[PDB]
Curated annotation (Swiss-Prot):
Lipid-modified residues, S-palmitoyl cysteine kind: C116
Full-protein interval shown: 389 to 672 of 1480
Gene: CFTR
Consequence of substituting D36Y: In CBAVD; uncertain significance
Positions annotated to bind ATP 1: W13, S27, G51, S52, T53, G54, A55, G56, K57, T58, Q86
Subunit structure comment from the entry: Monomer; does not require oligomerization for channel activity. May form oligomers in the membrane. Interacts with SLC26A3, SLC26A6 and SHANK2. Interacts with NHERF1 and MYO6. Interacts (via C-terminus) with GOPC (via PDZ domain); this promotes CFTR internalization and thereby decreases channel activity. Interacts with SLC4A7 through NHERF1. Found in a complex with MYO5B and RAB11A. Interacts with ANO1. Interacts with SLC26A8. Interacts with AHCYL1; the interaction increases CFTR activity. Interacts with CSE1L.
Protein name: Cystic fibrosis transmembrane conductance regulator
Tissue-level expression: Expressed in the respiratory airway, including bronchial epithelium, and in the female reproductive tract, including oviduct (at protein level). Detected in pancreatic intercalated ducts in the exocrine tissue, on epithelial cells in intralobular striated ducts in sublingual salivary glands, on apical membranes of crypt cells throughout the small and large intestine, and on the reabsorptive duct in eccrine sweat glands. Detected on the equatorial segment of the sperm head (at protein level). Detected in nasal and bronchial superficial epithelium.
Species of the source: Homo sapiens (Human)
Outcome of substituting K57M: Impaired maturation of glycan chains indicating impaired trafficking from the endoplasmic reticulum to the cell membrane
Length: 258
């Protein structure tokens, strides 16, 4: 498992532009994508990250993967990362080879396809998981294949960027319980999600809004620290993940800080 820490992190996607402008002539001010971000999770813990559209959630994951350097603060992490990107993707080849890396573990594979609900899908194909991607998959199928790929990989830190985005409420719930909570029980993970139930199960919660930490702490803390926000969303969780994003974004603007 990895430990993960951000201490006072501020970052600007535009920083490079400023550096080139100064180079051509021989710290940047602007709109930070992330501002004064703090969190720590221990080995094996889950951090749920939520927030409004454009808040920096994906950008936060990108900093952990070394794609964006902090202009201020420190990030500490080590080890192997598995990343489930916000848009799904599929490489030419079988369903099974979309899921598995260099090595194959029969049992691990079966338990991944089971927890991501891919069994019923696969059983409707003449060639099962050996069907070649010819035929095209739904957005829901693709996203579940992409999550199985990320979770199958043996890693130290799993970064799951809205993997329930295109799923219904029921499928989202079973997969969250079987995969994220059971199958990955002992793994360090960061899940971008809009479900209040998910934040209730997390070890830590980070809510972002306009780049800033709207909230960091536990679920109990959230209910008292942001009591009107909490009250308005706690029936939000019966809406689709797709739909909960617009509502959550409205709700953060509604109870935005000072
Ligand atoms: N990989 C990237 N490289 C550079 N800029 C990025 C990258 N990903 C997102 N951005 C930009 O960073 C800013 C913050 O948005 P980001 O995508 O981090 O928000 P988000 O909270 O993930 O939103 P959504 O909820 O809409 O997925 C946006 O202007 C976006 O265009
Ligand atoms: Mg999102």
């Amino acid at each position: 498992t990895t430990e993960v820490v951000m201490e006072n992190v501020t970052a600007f996607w535009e920083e490079g532009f400023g550096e080139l402008f100064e180079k051509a002539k021989q710290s940047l001010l602007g709109t930070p994508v992330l501002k004064d971000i703090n969190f720590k999770i221990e080995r094996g813990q889950l951090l749920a990250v939520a927030g409004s559209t454009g808040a920096g959630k994906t950008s936060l994951l990108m900093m952990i993967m070394g794609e964006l350097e902090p202009s201020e603060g420190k990030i500490k992490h080590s080890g192997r990362i598995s990343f489930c990107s916000q848009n799904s993707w599929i490489m030419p080849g079988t369903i099974k080879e979309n899921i598995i890396g260099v090595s194959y573990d029969e049992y691990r594979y079966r338990s991944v396809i089971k927890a991501c609900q891919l069994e019923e899908d696969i059983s409707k194909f003449a060639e099962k998981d050996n069907i070649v991607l010819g035929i095209t998959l739904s957005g829901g199928q693709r996203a579940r294949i992409s999550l199985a790929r990320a979770v199958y990989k043996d890693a130290d830190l799993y970064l799951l960027d809205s993997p329930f985005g295109y799923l219904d409420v029921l499928t989202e719930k079973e997969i969250f319980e079987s995969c994220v909570c059971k199958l990955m029980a002992n793994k360090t993970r960061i899940l971008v999600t809009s479900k209040m139930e998910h934040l209730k199960k997390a070890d830590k919660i980070l809510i972002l809004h306009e780049g800033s930490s709207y909230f960091y702490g536990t679920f109990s803390e959230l209910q008292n620290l942001r009591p009107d926000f909490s009250s308005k969303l706690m029936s939000f969780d019966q809406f689709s993940a797709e739909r909960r994003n617009s509502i959550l974004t409205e709700t953060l603007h509604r109870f935005s800080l000072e």
